[model samples]
Target: PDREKALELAMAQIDKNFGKGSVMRLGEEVRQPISVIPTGSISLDVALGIGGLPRGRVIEIYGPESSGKTTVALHAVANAQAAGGIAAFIDAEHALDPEYAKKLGVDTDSLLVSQPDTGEQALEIADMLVRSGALDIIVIDSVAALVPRAEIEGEMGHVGLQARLMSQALRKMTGALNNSGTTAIFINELRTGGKALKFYASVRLDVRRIETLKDGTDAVGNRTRVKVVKNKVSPPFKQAEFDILYGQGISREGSLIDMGVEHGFIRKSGSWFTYEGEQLGQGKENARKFLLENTDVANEIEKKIKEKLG
Candidate 1:
């Protein structure tokens, strides 16, 4: 009761000092412009109007397997590093390949790769890193890996509890990211499910590969199209397309690059737009179901190919 009365007294004092209109102006000074750090992929950056991912916010990227989730992340890390800021990756399932980091131009010596095997461990490591005041960006490869097993069981109220648990963990991580002015990325696995599962993410990017023919011969080439599912700071329809090279690096090609370049074409535009206007290759989905399922390949060999090809 004393606390309630203290709150009333503070409101009255506020009215006495700043007057009735001051309350309306409370958030007027809080509107600081968002600083969009480029993703180093022109098409992807174009989709995110502010530049790259919205800085100092939690952005969730979700997609099916081979949907370019890790590739986008590798590119982002490279972009952040090139921007002269430190970045970290919290590997919940120990999925990150150190060899891959080198290919992305992420100085492994400077980049902090924390291997936390469990959800709890991942959270602990992420919190500590965020508080360390040394990170510019931190990515959680996928939230599904970090979800508590018990909460996602086939029991009653499991879904709700699972959602609550995941949300709490995500909220806590994002809070730390915000406080430290770091961009936090949560990669989520895409599940074909009912409404509840879809509603869990804050910003969702649905990725899938599209294929096309090249050089008059049937070759395997893939491009990923990302459809934005949710966005609090901006509209959700913002879309971008990125081409994935089997051995080479990723690049932005098509109208998306044109759009990004038209907007500014500044700094890393060349790198981001490197493959712009190139026709997309054969869709990865058409390939044998398991031919390219190797995250290891992406982590180990793809980066090397990208560096050489670029």
Candidate 2:
């Protein structure tokens, strides 16, 4: 009874010092583990370990031109919207194509695309969205294209001003993003002199074009390699390869087949594959078609993939 009385007095003192409901008792705030938004590619999600990008954090995707950086960001946006969340795209470079985004399963009718003239203005817009608690995802396409207001006004001619501005804006916004509920910020940037902002990123991905797919000298698509350079949510240096076909955006037939084989979802025998006693024919195309046709099997394959990576 003496100990109980002491504990009660301590609780009262805490409440008095921090206002009512400000202090939580031990185990009072326990809840289920928070989930992430998938990146739309099973292979990429598996590589990420958490299955997707975590909410309430900043993620950076940077690479050379035509390295599939924007494509990956668009895929994440599409996945976010599909999960019943609204999204915004700050098109600093004016490179967003509505038709292509739609082709990747993004609902253009509900997405907000803004073209901000300055980097500070873009950060302000992002800050507003994050604090509003309404948006689920915000994407800034190519931070290298963002010009500081001072530079645009011709008041600053120095070379490193842009990077400094970016670093300052990111530092100011980090706290809000960490506290925001289920909101994610995806920033696309070029690799040139991006070391400053990278320090503020929770996840940093590097993408590069590997090879061009051609049919008798006519280009059909290109192969790209995605590497996780820095990841706070999972182990870094994990890499994956995917193809961007001409008509089909971000195809992963080879990845699917390889993972399926590894997980025993599909059996392969000397150039032939079979899933559940059904012959999937002889190549990657047939394997992809089989999975698409069999939704249950495809889902099982995905589940196995997640388990293997989890």
Candidate 3:
């Protein structure tokens, strides 16, 4: 009874100091919806489970060379811009391609690109950007490229120097990131040795190069696999596969047919496909074209897919 009385007294004090309704009970507090920015790929979004990447968290994407890590980051920036949010790209590796980024839907004109000489400078700039409350998303291209201040200036042959610098930078940045409510994605190249910076990430993804699509031995595109190693917003270990075509962007390939068959949107017999007693076509390409031609049917399928995946 005294505890309850003390609580009421504290509430009265708050009201007296401020105004009426200044103090609210825990149950009376309103909850804000979690923010998620889509990465422009439906299959990838579904695999992420939250519909897309969650805001107010640090997401790490690390993989071997040419595994579509930069492509995914560009997609996120494009999506963030579409949602009326500002974005920045800290190109630590200096490998950001303006033409490719444009093709991926990133607004080259409005997007801010910062090329910092060292990781310390990058983190310093990032800290200012996060605290500025102006940008909603920031992409750091390849943590592996970030050169630490000590390594850049200090004497050569120092052991554990890079790791120490990275750990310190991440330790300082993670708190600011969580408090600022901005989505920050760090692209990292996979290394054989120890990876200490990944420990600070709330979500970690591993991108793997599955296969290469070629035209007469000339590599035209790639099939990449994205697997969630750690995810705080959803269940972990979910995997998604996407194709990056040469001229075309990320294509779902036979996603329509696959989802259709799974959801009974399309009936298959040997090599033929039928939808509602009407023959669509044979082969994945023909089925995709059929779906494209029928907007209503395609929209319905997409809606069901979102419902099932989301």
Candidate 4:
């Protein structure tokens, strides 16, 4: 009886002294399941292992020029919109093309587009958009050219300024983003000292152009190698390759075919192939074509492949 009385008295005294909720109860703390935004590439989605980027988190997609940085970001945006969610694109580089975005299945009429002047302006716009909570996903086209307003006003060369500015910008958004449903993606170029990005990003993707794909001497597309350099939602260092056809985005069906073969979902015997007990074609090219022609069949096949992804 004395020990029970002591426990009651202790609990009463804690609330009286510190106020209710001053010390959070661990069991009462909020814990929720995570959701994801899938990029267009099936191979990439498999590598991510969660379908795509973790919902309401910061993601970093960085690489060299012409390495499919903008293309992947746009694909994610299109996917988000296709799921009946709203999207925004901060064309910080002032290079976004509505026509090209439309080719990727983006609804130009519904998509929010902004081209801000300076780095601070872009950050402010992004912060305000997230705080508004009106978007499901947003893309800051690039960070390489987020030229600080101060540097432009002053001398050309400025040391440590960009890093400081980036850190502060990210700090302001971190709390707001933590409680929101908008998944923010920052497109960056090949440059070091992105320490702020590394810390804030739950997932970091490194993309590179591996080869040029041609159709009878005409360069139709390029093969992009995307590596998950840092992933907090899934396994990191997982990589995938997909062809980025000009104006058409990544070859989704083609990627699905490659991944299915790799996972043995589609078996190849000599020059012949089989899927679900049916012979598909004689070569990889024909198999991919068949998949494209019969997208419904390909989707069911994709669903089976995703089962192994677990």
The CA lDDT at 50 in model 3 is 71
Extract clashing residue pairs from model 3: none
Question: What clash pairs does model 1 have?
Answer: 211-282, 211-283, 212-281, 212-282, 249-306
- For model 2, the superposed segments whose C-alpha errors exceed 4 Å read 1-33, 182-193, 214-218, 252-254
Question: Which consecutive 10 residues in model 4 have the weakest lDDT in total?
Answer: 23-32
lDDT value, candidate 1, whole model: 0.58
Leading candidate by lDDT: 4
Tell me the whole-model lDDT of each prediction, alpha carbons only: 0.58, 0.73, 0.75, 0.80
TM-score, cand. 1? 0.64
RMSD of 3: 8.0
Per-residue lDDT tens digits for candidate 1, residues 1-310, read 5996887778678757943323322222222244566665655554554456766666677777777787777777777788888888887657676676677566778888776655566767888888776788888876767655553344455344445555566567666777787777777766512133244344556767665424246564566778766654444566777666664446433323334334432112322322223322243232212123533322332333223322
Candidates 2 and 4, the one with greater lDDT: 4
- Worst ten-residue run, lDDT, model 1? 266-275
What lDDT does candidate 1 reach at residue 263?
43
Cα lDDT tens digits for candidate 3, 263-287: 6767898788887787777865577
Can you write out model 4's per-residue Cα lDDT over 1-310, one digit (the tens) per residue?
6986887688678757954423333323222235567788888887776778777788899998899988888889888898898998888677888899889889989998888878888888999998888788989887867778887676764587778888999997877886877889999988532679998888899999998877347777889999998866554678989988777788887788788888888887888878888878876557777888988878988898877764
Q: Per-candidate RMSD vs. true structure? A: 12.2, 7.8, 8.0, 7.7
What's the candidate order when arranged by decreasing TM-score?
4, 2, 3, 1
List candidate 3 segments past 4 Å from native: 1-33, 191-194, 214-220, 252-254, 273-281, 289-297
TM-score per candidate: 0.64, 0.82, 0.80, 0.84
Native-vs-model 3 lDDT?
0.75
How well does candidate 2 match the true structure in TM-score terms? 0.82
